[PDB]
Design a protein around this ligand. Structure first.
Ligand SMILES: Nc1ncnc2c1ncn2[C@@H]1O[C@H](COP(=O)(O)OP(=O)(O)O)[C@@H](O)[C@H]1O
Ligand SMILES: Nc1ncnc2c1ncn2[C@@H]1O[C@H](COP(=O)(O)OP(=O)(O)O)[C@@H](O)[C@H]1O
Ligand SMILES: [Mg+2]
Ligand SMILES: [Mg+2]
Ligand SMILES: [Mg+2]
Ligand SMILES: [Mg+2]
Lengths: 237, 121, 237, 121
């Protein structure tokens, strides 16, 4: 894992790119107001201040994600388990990615193979974060011209625990990267050459969360066609 | 009222840029990625394209390149509006027919000045 | 230089710390306005929007510094030289650090050993950035209880070029760090334990700038007492 | 009107926090580092200390510790207002006598609520 230092330096630039997206909005609307003081009514001004507050919240979160990363590398993150219904947990996650998936005309689907009161002893916030990460990547890495772009959550329970699959007809993942995509800061060359927004952190965070539950995450995909992400979480003790 | 194709993957940016553009009386058509953009170009010709670079599905450079290889598209003025710092990126975009390149974050007034300059040429 | 990976991970947390300082101001004033819509007059509102715009500019700059870092590591930064008067260049730099040095009651002093129309063929913006970095560190790392805290710029020309010294009666620098303080992401343990704001980038950037002029930078200091930074820039061709 | 010692190394924060505090009629005394703070404490006792952690010259924890070792100082209520995320840092500050710990960025209203709660105890 030497070449890891070459990854961390490409990440610095990627951090500036995504941090300056909400900053654009903030400095934008703020200048809009500061100039159009007469023209603006004091009720659209409210609408404008709202989005500044919300956008400064978004970049607070992007920083929080950086901390939670270094909270896992430094190895101190606590996992607060409880009994949750995964059916409504993933439904909440599917509903959270609605507007993002709509934009790029990606269909979000949830399918359960086993009757739906599926309960498990897991961290409700941390598992959601895993779902969102995978779901997002599903949308983020969809094919250029594929008639119907979709992301599919398949929820099943078997093999001594619960099994979650996140399927997409997307750009697929090459063989040499099938393992390395879970490394910190690792992005597949394609993401770099085709200017895809990203950090290389999502999956590294995701993996550590899954394995802190004593579970496992892997990927089965072929470069042209479809990517499937497998998340397994054990149930009994 | 002129028509503008706004291409960017951030809704907040689109919503913001749309407000400044519509304030000057222009009609705005939004596209959230490179492919969406090209689909909308096939069934109408806008007076201006405001173009982001880093997007899912299709990036801005790909768009810039695909605009060039068509006669009806390569004459449409393009402002590249990107969160990318580079002088290589600016130079590349210009060589692919982009008129102006503006770094994010930017001044909405100076943006408006530059939009008007290209619509009155 | 193996342990460099351990430094880059402490930097992630340090980046969040300094980025969320101007963000505090932005989300602050923005909430102040959004709530006190009636109470606020439309002329203090101007004063408030101004500082939001300026503070979002400050964090734009903090991101710019991160790029310029990775612009030197990736090795593409162009140096635009011209003939500048260093006397007024450092005076401008001394005047730029005025309010910061005042705060922590640090005296900023400029002294020239050679008559003052000292000209050199150098990048006016990049050298200033070096001056500011050293000057800032002068203030940033001053002694707890030293009657009069000072930072001193001594400008002289000798030894085949121009010699700039930045002196401070500050916390000093240990022997093992005398060389390593110019490495990327390197901060002396003291900076970490005593919660001093910083990134570990300043000097790494500074060094690369100095050496791109074909010059050299070193430090002579003793841990208790005083630190002197030497910047040498050659003149003839 | 109660008196508050505002300790922080960022002028913009001080200026902002001062405005919210003075809006509620309070008198504000500003300190830009841990040492400045302690100098001002020796020649007056405030009703509240708003304290930053990461500062040059002297950090907030050092302050917290030096406040404890004096009788006239260890009863003054302290809000720690820091850009540091940690649960270890919150716990440490509390064990050093800090009443509340608030993470930056924060809500100026909730801050004001917490200030009033400690000044009416
Ligand atoms: N569904 C997917 N299809 C194709 N490639 C993917 C998918 N998910 C992840 N990848 C690749 O794995 C890398 C790591 O993923 P992630 O940790 O989420 O980083 P990023 O922030 O770049 O998305 C991505 O940069 C991308 O190249
Ligand atoms: N004048 C000084 N006195 C004492 N220590 C210093 C001084 N300047 C720099 N240092 C040490 O060298 C490290 C590197 O400096 P710099 O690159 O500016 O990083 P930082 O962003 O932490 O200031 C600092 O973290 C500090 O520990
Ligand atoms: Mg991701
Ligand atoms: Mg984009
Ligand atoms: Mg520094
Ligand atoms: Mg501070």
């Amino acid at each position: 894992l030497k070449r890891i230092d070459r990854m961390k330096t490409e990440f610095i630039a990627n951090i500036s790119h995504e941090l300056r997206t909400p900053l654009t909005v903030i400095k934008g609307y703020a200048e809009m107001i500061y100039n159009s003081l007469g023209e603006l009514d004091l009720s659209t001004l409210k609408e404008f201040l709202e989005t500044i507050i919300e956008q400064s919240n978004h970049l607070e979160n992007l920083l929080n994600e950086l901390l939670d990363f270094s909270r896992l590398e430094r190895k101190s993150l606590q996992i607060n388990r409880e009994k949750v219904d995964l059916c409504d947990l993933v439904e909440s996650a599917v509903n959270a990615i609605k507007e993002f998936a709509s934009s790029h005309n990606v269909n979000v689907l949830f399918e359960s193979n086993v009757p739906c009161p599926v309960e498990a002893y897991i961290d409700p916030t941390r598992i959601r974060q895993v779902l969102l990460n995978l779901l997002n990547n599903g949308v983020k890495y969809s094919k250029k011209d594929a008639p119907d772009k979709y992301v599919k959550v398949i929820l099943d329970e078997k093999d001594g625990g619960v099994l979650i699959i996140v399927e997409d007809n997307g750009i697929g993942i090459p063989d040499h990267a099938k393992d390395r995509i879970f490394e910190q800061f690792y992005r597949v060359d394609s993401s770099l050459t085709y200017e895809v927004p990203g950090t290389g952190l999502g999956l590294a965070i995701t993996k550590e969360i899954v394995e802190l539950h004593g579970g496992r995450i892997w990927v089965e995909s072929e470069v042209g066609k479809g990517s499937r992400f497998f998340v397994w979480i054990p149930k009994d003790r | 009222s002129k028509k503008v194709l706004l291409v960017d993957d951030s809704a907040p940016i689109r919503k913001m840029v749309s407000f400044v553009l519509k304030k000057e009386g222009y009609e705005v058509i939004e596209a959230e990625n490179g492919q969406i953009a090209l689909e909308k170009l096939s069934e109408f010709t806008p007076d201006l394209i405001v173009l982001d670079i880093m997007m899912p599905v299709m990036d801005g450079f790909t768009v810039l390149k695909k605009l060039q290889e068509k006669e009806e598209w390569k004459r449409i003025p393009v402002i590249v509006l990107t969160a990318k710092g580079g002088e290589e990126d600016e130079s590349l975009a210009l060589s692919l027919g982009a008129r102006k390149v503006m770094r994010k974050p930017f001044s909405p007034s100076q943006f408006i000045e530059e939009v008007k300059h290209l619509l009155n040429e």
